[model samples]
Target: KILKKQELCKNLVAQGMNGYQHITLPNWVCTAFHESSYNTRATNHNTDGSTDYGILQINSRYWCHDGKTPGSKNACNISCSKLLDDDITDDLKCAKKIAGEAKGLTPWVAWKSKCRGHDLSKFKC
Candidate 1:
């Protein structure tokens, strides 16, 4: 499912990304576009032999199980397939855990380069 910017904002807010783990709504939206372009079915097989799944691009290396990644932490204890669905409740839940563990958006490489310290005003809810 291809979700638009404004459409996704509502989902994130309802899912409690508004201030979850101290992450701003705009940062969440900013990272969303940079990662998957709001495509829920998005998947990118990494050069490291792992995979990034769903709109949040939750990593298979330490977040989900794809049964193919060399080292799977499966920190979220969720299946990689689950992150691909249009319903992102689980995706956001796992993302929250990641943030809680890492204490920030450090795990999301895209956020550092694409969302951090940039003008994220365009991604308002």
Candidate 2:
């Protein structure tokens, strides 16, 4: 799961940080793991139709395509473009931002916060 997300991150990064500014790989990884486990094909069944596709879970079908094809690069671009549009990365970045804003490296705070004692050296955030 992480590997896939890393690959996707590489693509986003390759497009230049401007496309993914302020979005770090570690944060992206943690959030993807927390959100959809790197499931690029995942989608929401709720009425909002607010989310769809990739680790970032952008609503590719609606907000992305603009009535064209689904899962196309245009769709992906729409999703990725959001990273800069509002000074935020994709959903993964937003999730990471939320985590970073709240707890920094110790994201999964709900789970990690419950642990009485444990080494957190692995996290470098």
Candidate 3:
């Protein structure tokens, strides 16, 4: 399901703020727009044969199973398909885990390219 931008921003800010204290809510809002445009069913193909899934575009290479691919590390221990669902609870959990990593939001290329060092005040909840 596709969420309105304001709804997406509010929901992301609410979910992201709990565990991702180090990352700003506006950054999450910006990243969600760049990564998936707030569509829960969003998916994208990567050159390495893995797929990016859901609002944050969690990658299959390390986070979840892509179904067709075998031996995914499944760091989040979730099926990539689950990320595609409209209910973002699982997606938020996995995204928080990713944000908690040493590299932080660096795993999300869109964060670096668009959100980082940008004026994100307008996205603030």
For model 1, how many clashes? 0
Residue ranges of candidate 3 with Cα displaced over 4 Å: 13-19
Q: Summarize candidate 2's per-residue lDDT along 17-107 as a digit string, tens digits.
A: 3224354455444544554565554444435433344454555343454333444444234543343232223544444443445554343
**Would you list the C-alpha lDDT of every candidate in the order shown?**
0.91, 0.43, 0.82
Candidate topping TM-score:
1
Q: In the order shown, what is each candidate's alpha-carbon RMSD?
A: 1.1, 8.9, 1.9
Compute the lDDT for candidate 1. Answer: 0.91
Q: Give residue 1's error in model 3 in angstroms.
A: 1.5
Query: Candidate 2 at 78: error in angstroms?
Result: 5.8
Q: What tens digits encode model 3's per-residue C-alpha lDDT throughout 1-125?
A: 98776777566666745337567677787888889988899999987788999988998989998876545789999999999998888898898888878447888899899888889886665
Candidate order by TM-score, decreasing, is 1, 3, 2
lDDT of 1 by residue, 17-103 (tens): 788878889998889899999999999998999999999999999999999999899999999999998898899889899888988
Which pairs of residues collide in model 3?
none
lDDT for residue 84 in candidate 2, whole number 0-100: 24
User: Model 3 shows how many backbone clashes?
Assistant: 0
